[PDB]
Amino acid sequence: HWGYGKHNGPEHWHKDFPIAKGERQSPVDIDTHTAKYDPSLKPLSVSYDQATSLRILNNGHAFNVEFDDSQDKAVLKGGPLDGTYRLIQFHFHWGSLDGQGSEHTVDKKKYAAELHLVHWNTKYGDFGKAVQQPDGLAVLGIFLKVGSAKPGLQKVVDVLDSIKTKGKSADFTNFDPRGLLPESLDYWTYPGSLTTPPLLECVTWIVLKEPISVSSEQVLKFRKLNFNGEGEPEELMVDNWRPAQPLKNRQIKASFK
Numbered sequence: 268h269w270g271y272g273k274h275n276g277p278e279h280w281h282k283d284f285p286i287a288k289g290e291r292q293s294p295v296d297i298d299t300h301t302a303k304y305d306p307s308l309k310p311l312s313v314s315y316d317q318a319t320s321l322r323i324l325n326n327g328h329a330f331n332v333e334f335d336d337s338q339d340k341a342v343l344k345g346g347p348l349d350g351t352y353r354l355i356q357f358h359f360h361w362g363s364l365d366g367q368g369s370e371h372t373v374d375k376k377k378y379a380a381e382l383h384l385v386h387w388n389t390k391y392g393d394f395g396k397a398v399q400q401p402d403g404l405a406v407l408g409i410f411l412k413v414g415s416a417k418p419g420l421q422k423v424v425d426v427l428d429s430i431k432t433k434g435k436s437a438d439f440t441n442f443d444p445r446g447l448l449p450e451s452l453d454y455w456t457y458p459g460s461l462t463t464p465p466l467l468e469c470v471t472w473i474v475l476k477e478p479i480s481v482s483s484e485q486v487l488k489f490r491k492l493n494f495n496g497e498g499e500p501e502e503l504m505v506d507n508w509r510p511a512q513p514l515k516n517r518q519i520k521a522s523f524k
């Protein structure tokens with residue numbers, strides 16, 4: 268099955284998922300000088316006051332913090348989006364070292380990690396139908412750099428010891444994802460894809476310009492997770508990022524001057 272190793276990593280994915288070589292794949296490098304300011308773009312509306320986290324899961328590729336998406340709560344609107352997108356999960360991608368880990372890059376700069384808050388378009392009724400549509404998902408991407416600790420991340424960090432291996436989950440209620448946001452909601456946006464198989468071309472990407480700072484100790488704890496299941500050979504969960512893909516016929520738009 269697919270993964271991040273030499274024999275099953277991103278360069279192999281196209282054999283089982285030929286859309287890997289498609290026209291709107293993610294991530295991409297964001298060339299800041301060629302991204303054009305679009306004054307028609309709206310401020311992003313992130314309304315996470317209500318949300319309701321349920322669980323955290325090690326799925327063998329990353330860990331997902333999952334939300335109850337059965338009601339109109341935790342929604343992303345505005346920005347480049349038409350209509351309302353509901354939060355279902357967030358997860359991260361990160362490196363073996365602080366100098367790599369992000370999926371998107373900024374003028375070729377790689378951040379230590381990248382947070383993806385995943386939302387589905389409520390006009391398609393649920394996530395499984397939404398991923399079959401070109402405007403089905405909106406993923407809010409946030410870069411992580413290593414410096415000061417992010418206090419709002421620590422509850423996530425501390426539960427990781429309980430989901431070390433693939434297939435482990437833990438109750439994870441009352442986690443407020445507002446604690447993971449930077450101050451500014453300035454963003455870049457472009458049409459793309461899921462960055463893991465099945466690589467579906469269903470995502471409006473919204474990537475925040477301002478990174479959050481996390482501590483070295485916080486990211487070191489991400490790197491203690493395992494790709495493998497319990498009682499299998501230990502493979503540290505590191506470098507679970509897809510490299511930048513060809514931009515092809517797309518424009519990246521900036522919300523800010």
Ligand SMILES: Nc1nnc(SCC(=O)Nc2ccc(S(N)(=O)=O)cc2)s1
Pocket residue numbers: 268269270274275276279280281282283284
């Ligand atoms: N039952 C088994 N499933 N997988 C194995 S290891 C060999 C294997 O399946 N390799 C492999 C499978 C899929 C992909 S891919 N194209 O990256 O999804 C890459 C590599 S033994």
Ligand SMILES: Nc1nnc(SCC(=O)Nc2ccc(S(N)(=O)=O)cc2)s1
Pocket residue numbers: 383385394395396398406460461462463464465
């Ligand atoms: N009916 C279906 N249920 N689930 C699926 S695919 C699930 C999935 O692959 N989700 C997912 C994958 C990648 C990303 S990402 N890294 O944010 O582009 C977000 C979300 S199709």
Ligand SMILES: [Zn+2]
Pocket residue numbers: 358359360383462
């Ligand atoms: Zn992701």
